[PDB]
Amino acid sequence: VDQVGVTDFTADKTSAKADGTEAITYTATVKKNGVAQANVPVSFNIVSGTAVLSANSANTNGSGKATVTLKSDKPGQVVVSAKTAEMTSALNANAVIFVDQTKASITEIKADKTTAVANGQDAITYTVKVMKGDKPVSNQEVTFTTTLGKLSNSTEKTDTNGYAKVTLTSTTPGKSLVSARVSDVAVDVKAPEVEFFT
Ligand SMILES: [Cl-]
Ligand SMILES: [Cl-]
Ligand SMILES: [Mg+2]
Ligand SMILES: [Mg+2]
Ligand SMILES: [Mg+2]
Last residue of a domain, one of 44, 70, 99: 99
Rg of the chain in Å (alpha carbons): 18
- Between CA 127 and CA 131 the distance in angstroms is 13
Number of Cβ within a 10 Å radius of residue 72: 26
Ligand that comes closest to the CA of residue 11: 1
Name the resolution in angstroms: 1.8
User: What spacing in Å lies between the alpha carbon of 144 and ligand 2's midpoint?
Assistant: 15
> Which residues have beta carbons under 5 A from ligand 2 (an ion)?
149-150, 170-171
CA-closest candidate to residue 106, choices 97, 117, 114, 119: 97
> Which residues have beta carbons under 5 A from ligand 5 (an ion)?
123
38: Cα separation from own chain's centroid: 27
Q: Which residues contact 39 (CB under 8 A, 6 or more apart)?
A: 59, 60
Number of Cβ within a 10 Å radius of residue 109: 24
Q: Are residues 41 and 79 in the same domain?
A: yes
- Between CA 136 and CA 161 the distance in angstroms is 6
User: What spacing in Å lies between the alpha carbon of 141 and ligand 5's midpoint?
Assistant: 24
Q: Residue 122 sits in a domain of what CATH number? A: 2.60.40.10
Q: Are residues 56 and 136 in the same domain?
A: no
- Between CA 197 and CA 22 the distance in angstroms is 40
Concatenating the DSSP letter of every residue in 133-189 gives TTEE-SS-EEEEEESSSEES-SEEE--TTSEEEEEEE-SS-EEE-EEEE-TT----E
Last residue of a domain, one of 83, 99, 115: 99
Q: Are residues 113 and 184 in the same domain?
A: yes
CA-closest candidate to residue 57, choices 36, 85, 32: 85
- Between CA 126 and CA 70 the distance in angstroms is 25
Q: Are residues 69 and 149 in the same domain?
A: no
**Long-range contacts for 116-119 (Cβ within 8 Å, ≥24 apart)?**
116/169, 116/170, 116/194, 116/195, 116/196, 116/197, 117/196, 117/197, 117/198, 118/170, 118/171, 118/172, 118/173, 118/174, 118/196, 118/197, 118/198, 119/169, 119/171, 119/198
CA-closest candidate to residue 135, choices 159, 156, 157, 161: 161
Domain holding 94, by residue range, is 5-99
Q: Are residues 79 and 116 in the same domain?
A: no
For residue 25, CA distances in Å to 9, 37, 116, 130 come to: 10, 20, 31, 21
Q: Are residues 90 and 141 in the same domain?
A: no
Are 180 and 144 in contact, with CB atoms under 8 Å apart?
Answer: yes
Are 58 and 66 in contact, with CB atoms under 8 Å apart?
Answer: yes
Q: Are residues 22 and 52 in the same domain?
A: yes
Are 14 and 96 in contact, with CB atoms under 8 Å apart?
Answer: yes
For residue 128, CA distances in Å to 2, 108, 136, 162 come to: 39, 6, 11, 8
Computed from CA positions of residues 21, 24, 30, 35, in that sequence, does the dihedral angle turn out positive or negative? positive
User: What spacing in Å lies between the alpha carbon of 14 and ligand 1's midpoint?
Assistant: 6
Last residue of a domain, one of 66, 99, 132: 99
Max alpha carbon distance in the chain (Å)?
Answer: 51
User: What spacing in Å lies between the alpha carbon of 96 and ligand 1's midpoint?
Assistant: 7
